[PDB]
PDB file of C-alpha atoms in Angstrom:
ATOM      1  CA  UNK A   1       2.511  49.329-122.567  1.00 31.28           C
ATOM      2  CA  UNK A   2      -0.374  50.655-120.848  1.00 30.80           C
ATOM      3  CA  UNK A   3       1.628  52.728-118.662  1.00 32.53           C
ATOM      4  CA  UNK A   4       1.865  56.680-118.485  1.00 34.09           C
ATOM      5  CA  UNK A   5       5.500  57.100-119.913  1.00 32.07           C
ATOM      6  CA  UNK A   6       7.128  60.881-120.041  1.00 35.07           C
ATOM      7  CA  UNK A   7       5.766  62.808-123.024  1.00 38.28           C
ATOM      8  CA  UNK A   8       1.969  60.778-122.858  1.00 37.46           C
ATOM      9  CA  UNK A   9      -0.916  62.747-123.190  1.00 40.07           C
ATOM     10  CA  UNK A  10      -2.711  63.661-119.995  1.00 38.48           C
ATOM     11  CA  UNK A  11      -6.414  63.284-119.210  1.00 35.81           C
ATOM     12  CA  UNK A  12      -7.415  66.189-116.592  1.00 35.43           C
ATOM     13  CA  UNK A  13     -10.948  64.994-115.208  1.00 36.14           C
ATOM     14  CA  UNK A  14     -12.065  68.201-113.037  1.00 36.19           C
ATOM     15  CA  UNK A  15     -11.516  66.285-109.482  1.00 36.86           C
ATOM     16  CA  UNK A  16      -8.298  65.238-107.457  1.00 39.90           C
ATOM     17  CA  UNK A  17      -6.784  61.605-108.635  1.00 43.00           C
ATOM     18  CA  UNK A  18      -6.511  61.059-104.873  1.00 42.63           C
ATOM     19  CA  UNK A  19     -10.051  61.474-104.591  1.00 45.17           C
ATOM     20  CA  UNK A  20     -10.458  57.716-106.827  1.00 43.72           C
ATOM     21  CA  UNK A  21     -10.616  54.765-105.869  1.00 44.07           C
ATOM     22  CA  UNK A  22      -8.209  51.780-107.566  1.00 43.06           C
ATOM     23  CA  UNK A  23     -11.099  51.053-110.023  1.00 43.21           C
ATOM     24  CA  UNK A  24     -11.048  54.207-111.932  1.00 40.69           C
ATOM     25  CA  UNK A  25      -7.739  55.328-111.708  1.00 43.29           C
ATOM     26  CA  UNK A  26      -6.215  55.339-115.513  1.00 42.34           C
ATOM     27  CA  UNK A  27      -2.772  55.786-116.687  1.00 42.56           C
ATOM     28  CA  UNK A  28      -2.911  59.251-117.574  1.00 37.36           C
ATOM     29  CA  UNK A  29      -5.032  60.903-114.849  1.00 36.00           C
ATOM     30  CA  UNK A  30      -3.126  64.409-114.348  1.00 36.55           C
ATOM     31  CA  UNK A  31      -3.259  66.743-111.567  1.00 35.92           C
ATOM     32  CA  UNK A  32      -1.495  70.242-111.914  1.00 36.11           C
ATOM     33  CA  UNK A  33      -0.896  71.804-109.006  1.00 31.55           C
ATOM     34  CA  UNK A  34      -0.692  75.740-107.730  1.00 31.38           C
ATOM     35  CA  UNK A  35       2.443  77.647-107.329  1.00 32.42           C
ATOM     36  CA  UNK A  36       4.525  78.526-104.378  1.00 31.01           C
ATOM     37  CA  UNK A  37       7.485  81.239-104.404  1.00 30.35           C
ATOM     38  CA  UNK A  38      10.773  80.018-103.093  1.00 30.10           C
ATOM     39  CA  UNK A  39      11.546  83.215-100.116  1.00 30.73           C
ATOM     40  CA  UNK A  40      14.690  83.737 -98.346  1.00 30.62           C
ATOM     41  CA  UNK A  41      12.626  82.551 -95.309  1.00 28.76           C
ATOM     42  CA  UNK A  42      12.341  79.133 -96.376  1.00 28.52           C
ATOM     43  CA  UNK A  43      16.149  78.274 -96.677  1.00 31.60           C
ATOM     44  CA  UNK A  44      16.180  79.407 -92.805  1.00 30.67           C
ATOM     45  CA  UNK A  45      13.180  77.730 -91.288  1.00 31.77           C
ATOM     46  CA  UNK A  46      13.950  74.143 -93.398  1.00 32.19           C
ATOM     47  CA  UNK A  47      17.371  74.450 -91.790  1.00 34.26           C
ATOM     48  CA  UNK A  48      16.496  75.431 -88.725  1.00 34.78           C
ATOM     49  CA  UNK A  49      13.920  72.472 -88.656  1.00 37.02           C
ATOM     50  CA  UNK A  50      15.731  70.106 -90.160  1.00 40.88           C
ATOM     51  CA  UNK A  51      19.036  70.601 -88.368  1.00 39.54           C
ATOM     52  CA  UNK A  52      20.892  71.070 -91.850  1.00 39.42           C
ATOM     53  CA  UNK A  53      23.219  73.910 -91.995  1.00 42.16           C
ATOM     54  CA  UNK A  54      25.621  73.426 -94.884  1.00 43.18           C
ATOM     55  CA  UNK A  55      27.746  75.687 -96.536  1.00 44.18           C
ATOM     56  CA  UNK A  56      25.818  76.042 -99.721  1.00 46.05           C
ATOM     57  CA  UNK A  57      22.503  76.849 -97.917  1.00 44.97           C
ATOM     58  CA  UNK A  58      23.566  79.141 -94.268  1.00 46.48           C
ATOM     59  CA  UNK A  59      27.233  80.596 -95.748  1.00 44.96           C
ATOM     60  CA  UNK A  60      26.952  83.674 -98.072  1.00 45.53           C
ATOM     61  CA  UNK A  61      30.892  84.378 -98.620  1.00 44.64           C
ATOM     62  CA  UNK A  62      31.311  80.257 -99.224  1.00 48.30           C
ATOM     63  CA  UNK A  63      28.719  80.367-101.783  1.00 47.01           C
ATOM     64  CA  UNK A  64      29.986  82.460-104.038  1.00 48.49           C
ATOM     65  CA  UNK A  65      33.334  80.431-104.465  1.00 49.61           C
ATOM     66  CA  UNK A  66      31.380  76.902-104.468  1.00 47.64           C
ATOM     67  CA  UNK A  67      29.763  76.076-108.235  1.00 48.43           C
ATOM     68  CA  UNK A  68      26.545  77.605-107.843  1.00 47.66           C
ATOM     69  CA  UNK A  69      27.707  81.001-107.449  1.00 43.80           C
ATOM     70  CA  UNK A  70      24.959  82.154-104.734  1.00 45.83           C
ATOM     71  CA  UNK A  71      23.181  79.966-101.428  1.00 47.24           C
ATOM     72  CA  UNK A  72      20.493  78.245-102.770  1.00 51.85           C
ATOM     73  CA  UNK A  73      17.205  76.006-101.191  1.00 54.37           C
ATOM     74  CA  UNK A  74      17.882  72.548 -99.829  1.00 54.76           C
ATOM     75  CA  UNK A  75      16.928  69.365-102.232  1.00 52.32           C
ATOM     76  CA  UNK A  76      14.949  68.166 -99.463  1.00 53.48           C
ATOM     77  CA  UNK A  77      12.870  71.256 -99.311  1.00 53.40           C
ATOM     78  CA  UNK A  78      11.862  71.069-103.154  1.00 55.07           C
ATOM     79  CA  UNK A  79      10.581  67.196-102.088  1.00 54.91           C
ATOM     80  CA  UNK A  80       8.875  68.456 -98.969  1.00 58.62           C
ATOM     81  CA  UNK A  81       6.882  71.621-100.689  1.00 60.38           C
ATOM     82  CA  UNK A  82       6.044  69.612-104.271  1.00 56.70           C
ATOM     83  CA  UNK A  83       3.752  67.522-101.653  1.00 56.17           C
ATOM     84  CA  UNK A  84       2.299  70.169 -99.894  1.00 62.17           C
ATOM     85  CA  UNK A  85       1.172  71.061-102.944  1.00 63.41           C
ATOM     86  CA  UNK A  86      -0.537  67.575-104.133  1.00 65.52           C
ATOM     87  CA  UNK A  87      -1.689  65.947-100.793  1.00 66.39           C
ATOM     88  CA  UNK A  88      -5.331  65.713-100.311  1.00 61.50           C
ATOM     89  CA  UNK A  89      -6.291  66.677 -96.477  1.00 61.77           C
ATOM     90  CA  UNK A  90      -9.162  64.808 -96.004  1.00 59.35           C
ATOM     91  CA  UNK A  91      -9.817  61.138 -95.707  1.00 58.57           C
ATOM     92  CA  UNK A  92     -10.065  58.928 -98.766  1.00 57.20           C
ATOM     93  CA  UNK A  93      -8.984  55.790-100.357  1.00 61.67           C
ATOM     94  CA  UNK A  94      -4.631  56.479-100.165  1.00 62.31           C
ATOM     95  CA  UNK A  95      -3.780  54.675 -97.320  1.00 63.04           C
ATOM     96  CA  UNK A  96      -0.073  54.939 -97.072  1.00 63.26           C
ATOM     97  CA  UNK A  97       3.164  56.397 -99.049  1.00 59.94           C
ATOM     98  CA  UNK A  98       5.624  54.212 -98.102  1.00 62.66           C
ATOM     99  CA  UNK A  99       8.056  54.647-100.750  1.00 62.55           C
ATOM    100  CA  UNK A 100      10.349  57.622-103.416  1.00 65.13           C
ATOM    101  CA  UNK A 101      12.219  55.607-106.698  1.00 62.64           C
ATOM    102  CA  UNK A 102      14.109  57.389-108.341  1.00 67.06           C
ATOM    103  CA  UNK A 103      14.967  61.211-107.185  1.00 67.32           C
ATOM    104  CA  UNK A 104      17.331  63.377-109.379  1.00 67.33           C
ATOM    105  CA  UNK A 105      18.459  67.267-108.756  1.00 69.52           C
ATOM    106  CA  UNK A 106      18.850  68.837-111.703  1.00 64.80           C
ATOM    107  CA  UNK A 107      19.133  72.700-111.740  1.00 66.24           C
ATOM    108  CA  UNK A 108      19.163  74.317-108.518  1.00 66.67           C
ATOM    109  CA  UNK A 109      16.234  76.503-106.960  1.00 67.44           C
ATOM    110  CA  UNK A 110      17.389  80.055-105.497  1.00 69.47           C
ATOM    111  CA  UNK A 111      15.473  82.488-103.871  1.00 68.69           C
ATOM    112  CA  UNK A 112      13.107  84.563-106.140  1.00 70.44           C
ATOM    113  CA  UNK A 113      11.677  81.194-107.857  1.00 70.47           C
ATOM    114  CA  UNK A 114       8.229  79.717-108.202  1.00 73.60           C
ATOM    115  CA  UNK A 115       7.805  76.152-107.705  1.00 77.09           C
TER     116      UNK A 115
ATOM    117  CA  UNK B   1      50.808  82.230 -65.892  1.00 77.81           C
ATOM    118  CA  UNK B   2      49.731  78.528 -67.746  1.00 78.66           C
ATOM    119  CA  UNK B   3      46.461  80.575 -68.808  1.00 77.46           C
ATOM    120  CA  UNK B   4      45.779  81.440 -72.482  1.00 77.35           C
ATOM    121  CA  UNK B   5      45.846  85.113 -72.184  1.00 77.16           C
ATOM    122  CA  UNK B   6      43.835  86.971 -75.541  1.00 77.36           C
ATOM    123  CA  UNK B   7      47.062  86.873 -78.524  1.00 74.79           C
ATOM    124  CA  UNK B   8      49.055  83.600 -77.960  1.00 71.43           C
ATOM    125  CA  UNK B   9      49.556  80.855 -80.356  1.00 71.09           C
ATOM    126  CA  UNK B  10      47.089  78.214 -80.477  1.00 67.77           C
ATOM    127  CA  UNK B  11      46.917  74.466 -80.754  1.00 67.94           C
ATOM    128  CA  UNK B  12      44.586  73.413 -83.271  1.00 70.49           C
ATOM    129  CA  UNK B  13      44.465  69.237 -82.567  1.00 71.15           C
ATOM    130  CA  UNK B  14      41.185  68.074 -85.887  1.00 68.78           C
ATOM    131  CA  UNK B  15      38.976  66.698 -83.256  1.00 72.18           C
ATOM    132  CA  UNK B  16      36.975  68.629 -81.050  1.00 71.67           C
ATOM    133  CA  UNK B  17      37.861  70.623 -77.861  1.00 72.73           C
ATOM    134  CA  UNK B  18      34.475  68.935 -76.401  1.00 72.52           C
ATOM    135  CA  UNK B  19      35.739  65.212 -76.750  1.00 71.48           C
ATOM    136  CA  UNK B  20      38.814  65.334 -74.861  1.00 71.74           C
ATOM    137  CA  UNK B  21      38.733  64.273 -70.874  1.00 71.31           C
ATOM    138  CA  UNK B  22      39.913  66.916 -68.278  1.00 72.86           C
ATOM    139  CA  UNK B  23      43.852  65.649 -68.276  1.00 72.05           C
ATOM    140  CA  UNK B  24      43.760  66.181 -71.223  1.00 70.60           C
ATOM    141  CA  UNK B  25      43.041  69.464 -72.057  1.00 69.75           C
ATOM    142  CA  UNK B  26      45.773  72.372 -72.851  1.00 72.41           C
ATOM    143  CA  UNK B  27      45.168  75.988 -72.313  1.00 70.08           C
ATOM    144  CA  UNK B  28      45.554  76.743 -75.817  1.00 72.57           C
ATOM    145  CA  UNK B  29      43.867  74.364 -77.527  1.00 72.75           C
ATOM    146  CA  UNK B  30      41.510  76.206 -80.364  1.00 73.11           C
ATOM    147  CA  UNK B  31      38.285  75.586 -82.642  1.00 72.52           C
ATOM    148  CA  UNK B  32      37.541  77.588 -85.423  1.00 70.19           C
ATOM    149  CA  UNK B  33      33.348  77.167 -86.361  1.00 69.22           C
ATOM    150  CA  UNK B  34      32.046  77.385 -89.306  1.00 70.28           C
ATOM    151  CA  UNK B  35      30.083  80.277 -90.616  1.00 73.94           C
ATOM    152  CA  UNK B  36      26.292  81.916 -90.318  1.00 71.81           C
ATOM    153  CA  UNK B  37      24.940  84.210 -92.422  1.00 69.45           C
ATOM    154  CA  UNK B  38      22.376  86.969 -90.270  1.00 71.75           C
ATOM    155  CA  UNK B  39      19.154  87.387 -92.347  1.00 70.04           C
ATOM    156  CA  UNK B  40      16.506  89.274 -91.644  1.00 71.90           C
ATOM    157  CA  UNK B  41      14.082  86.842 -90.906  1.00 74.14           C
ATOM    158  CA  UNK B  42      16.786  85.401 -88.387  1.00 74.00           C
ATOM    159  CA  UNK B  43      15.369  89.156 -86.342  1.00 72.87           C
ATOM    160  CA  UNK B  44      11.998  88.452 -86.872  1.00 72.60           C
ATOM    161  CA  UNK B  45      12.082  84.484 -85.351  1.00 73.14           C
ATOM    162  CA  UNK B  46      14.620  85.509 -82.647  1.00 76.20           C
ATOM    163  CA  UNK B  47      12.088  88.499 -81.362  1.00 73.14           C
ATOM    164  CA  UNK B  48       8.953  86.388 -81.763  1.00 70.70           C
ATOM    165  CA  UNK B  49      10.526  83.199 -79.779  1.00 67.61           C
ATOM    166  CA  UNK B  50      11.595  85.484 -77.249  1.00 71.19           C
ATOM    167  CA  UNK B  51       9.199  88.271 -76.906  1.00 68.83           C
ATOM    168  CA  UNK B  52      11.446  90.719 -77.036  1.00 69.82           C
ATOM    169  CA  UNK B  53       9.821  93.562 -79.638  1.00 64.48           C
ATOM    170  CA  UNK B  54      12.335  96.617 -78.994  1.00 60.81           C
ATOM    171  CA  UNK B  55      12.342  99.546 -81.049  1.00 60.86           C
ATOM    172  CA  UNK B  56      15.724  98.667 -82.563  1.00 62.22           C
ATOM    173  CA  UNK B  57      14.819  95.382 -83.670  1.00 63.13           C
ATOM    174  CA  UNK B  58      11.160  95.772 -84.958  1.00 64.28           C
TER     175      UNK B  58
ATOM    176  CA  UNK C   1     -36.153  85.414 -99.149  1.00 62.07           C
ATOM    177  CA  UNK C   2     -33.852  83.558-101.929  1.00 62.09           C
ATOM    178  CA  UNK C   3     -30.895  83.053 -99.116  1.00 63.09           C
ATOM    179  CA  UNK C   4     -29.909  80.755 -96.970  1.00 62.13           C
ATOM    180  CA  UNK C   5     -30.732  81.059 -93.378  1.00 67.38           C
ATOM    181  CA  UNK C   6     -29.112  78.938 -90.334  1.00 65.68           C
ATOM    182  CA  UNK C   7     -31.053  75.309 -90.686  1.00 67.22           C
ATOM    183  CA  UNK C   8     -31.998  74.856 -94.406  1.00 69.24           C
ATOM    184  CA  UNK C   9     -30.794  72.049 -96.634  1.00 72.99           C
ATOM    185  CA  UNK C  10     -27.711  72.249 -98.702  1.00 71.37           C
ATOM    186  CA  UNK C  11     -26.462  71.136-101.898  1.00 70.94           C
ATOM    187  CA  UNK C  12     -23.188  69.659-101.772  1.00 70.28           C
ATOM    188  CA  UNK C  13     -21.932  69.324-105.085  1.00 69.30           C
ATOM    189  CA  UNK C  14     -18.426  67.453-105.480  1.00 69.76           C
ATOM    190  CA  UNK C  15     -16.479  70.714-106.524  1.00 69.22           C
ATOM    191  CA  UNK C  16     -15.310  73.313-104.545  1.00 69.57           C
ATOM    192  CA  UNK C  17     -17.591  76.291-103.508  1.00 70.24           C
ATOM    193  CA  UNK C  18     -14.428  78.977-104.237  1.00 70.23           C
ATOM    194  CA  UNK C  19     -14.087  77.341-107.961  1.00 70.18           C
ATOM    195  CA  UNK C  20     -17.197  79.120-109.574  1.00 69.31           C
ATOM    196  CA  UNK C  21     -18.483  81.894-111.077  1.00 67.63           C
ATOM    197  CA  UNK C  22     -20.808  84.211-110.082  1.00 65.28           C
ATOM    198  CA  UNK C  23     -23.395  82.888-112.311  1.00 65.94           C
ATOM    199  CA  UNK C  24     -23.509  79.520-110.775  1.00 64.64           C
ATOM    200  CA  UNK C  25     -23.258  79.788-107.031  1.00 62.88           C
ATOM    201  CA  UNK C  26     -26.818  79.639-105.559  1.00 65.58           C
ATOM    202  CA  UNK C  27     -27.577  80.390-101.778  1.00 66.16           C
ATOM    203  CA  UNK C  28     -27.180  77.228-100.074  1.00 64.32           C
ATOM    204  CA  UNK C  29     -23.868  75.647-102.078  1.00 67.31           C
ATOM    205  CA  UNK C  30     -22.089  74.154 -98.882  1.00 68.19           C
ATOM    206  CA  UNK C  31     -18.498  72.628 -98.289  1.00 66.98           C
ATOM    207  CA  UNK C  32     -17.042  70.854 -95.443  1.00 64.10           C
ATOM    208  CA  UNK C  33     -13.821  70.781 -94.382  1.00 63.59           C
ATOM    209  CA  UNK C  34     -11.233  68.332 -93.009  1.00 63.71           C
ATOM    210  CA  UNK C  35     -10.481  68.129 -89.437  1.00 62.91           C
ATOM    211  CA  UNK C  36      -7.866  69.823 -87.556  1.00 62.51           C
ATOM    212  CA  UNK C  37      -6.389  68.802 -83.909  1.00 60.95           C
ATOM    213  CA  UNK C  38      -5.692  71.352 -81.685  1.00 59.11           C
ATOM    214  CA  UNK C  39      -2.695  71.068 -79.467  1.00 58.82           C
ATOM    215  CA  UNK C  40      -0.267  72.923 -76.934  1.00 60.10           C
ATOM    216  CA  UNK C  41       2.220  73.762 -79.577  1.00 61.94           C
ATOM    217  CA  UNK C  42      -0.169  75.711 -81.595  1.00 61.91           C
ATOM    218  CA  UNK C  43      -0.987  78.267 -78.196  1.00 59.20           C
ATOM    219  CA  UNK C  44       2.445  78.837 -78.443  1.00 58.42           C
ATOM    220  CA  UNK C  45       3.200  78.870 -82.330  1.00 59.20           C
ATOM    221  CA  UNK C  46       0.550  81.605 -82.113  1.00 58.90           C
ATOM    222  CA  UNK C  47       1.214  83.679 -79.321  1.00 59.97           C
ATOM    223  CA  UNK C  48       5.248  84.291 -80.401  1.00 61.03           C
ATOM    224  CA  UNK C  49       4.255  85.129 -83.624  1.00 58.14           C
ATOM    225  CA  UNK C  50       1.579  87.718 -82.810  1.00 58.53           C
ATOM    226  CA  UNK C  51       2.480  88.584 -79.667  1.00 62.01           C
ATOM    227  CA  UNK C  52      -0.615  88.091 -77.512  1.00 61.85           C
ATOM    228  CA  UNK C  53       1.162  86.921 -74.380  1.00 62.67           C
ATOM    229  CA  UNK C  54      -2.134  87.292 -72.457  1.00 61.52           C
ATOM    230  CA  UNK C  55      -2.850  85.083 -69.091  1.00 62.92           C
ATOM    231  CA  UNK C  56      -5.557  82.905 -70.282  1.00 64.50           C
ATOM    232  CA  UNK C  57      -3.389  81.516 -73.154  1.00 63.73           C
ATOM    233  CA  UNK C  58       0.996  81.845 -71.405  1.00 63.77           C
TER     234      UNK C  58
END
């Protein structure tokens, strides 16, 4: 189909895919990215930034009788640190983002958790 | 003494106290917030925005 | 003198500087950086959290 699919191999080429230009980008160009540990800090600066303090994420006797058993980190946190992690800083040949597909949450991320 | 004093009943109306005009407003008319766990990096933000390093805090 | 001194060439080389070994790096491997904008929130972002309230800066 010449499309990257889910269980593809991956070609790693030494250099960041948003470093390419359209040309010699190639279904399959992989980037693996380094880690970042999940703190009890994060939780309170994303919803102090945000402006999102639900139960789940700011209560701690609400959380243990809601199905996850313990406060865990926001959904839009995990989206907002997996592209601090990819993002290139400097200026290249990505123009603009414009656009998420299809997001799903599957397990949740607690404190004490690398990303 | 048409006050709410500290252990009367209250009148709890599911909208908020800060919507209603001023006739119409009770003395007795109650909200219950939700709740906020104090971490310790609440302490640490609170005494850097501030600037208020005490010995009790820090 | 085998170093590299203030106005010498450089070699930039398409990989990062921090990503070899010892082996490899030779005296004159340079990187630079993206740009960064300075602004009024960063004074203050950086003065609450280290605490250097001095005149110049607050």
């Amino acid at each position: 189909s010449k499309q990257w699919v889910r269980g593809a191999k991956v070609e790693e080429d030494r250099i960041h895919p948003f470093r390419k230009y359209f040309e010699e980008l190639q279904p399959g160009d992989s980037l693996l990215t380094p880690r970042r540990t999940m703190t009890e800090a994060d939780i309170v600066n994303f919803a102090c930034l945000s402006g999102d303090h639900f139960y789940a994420h700011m209560d701690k006797i609400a959380a243990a009788e809601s199905i996850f058993g313990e406060r865990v980190v926001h959904g839009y946190f995990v989206l907002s640190a997996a592209a601090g992690l990819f993002v290139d800083a400097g200026v290249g040949p990505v123009i603009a983002n414009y656009g998420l597909e299809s997001l799903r949450f599957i397990e949740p991320v607690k404190p004490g958790d690398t990303i």
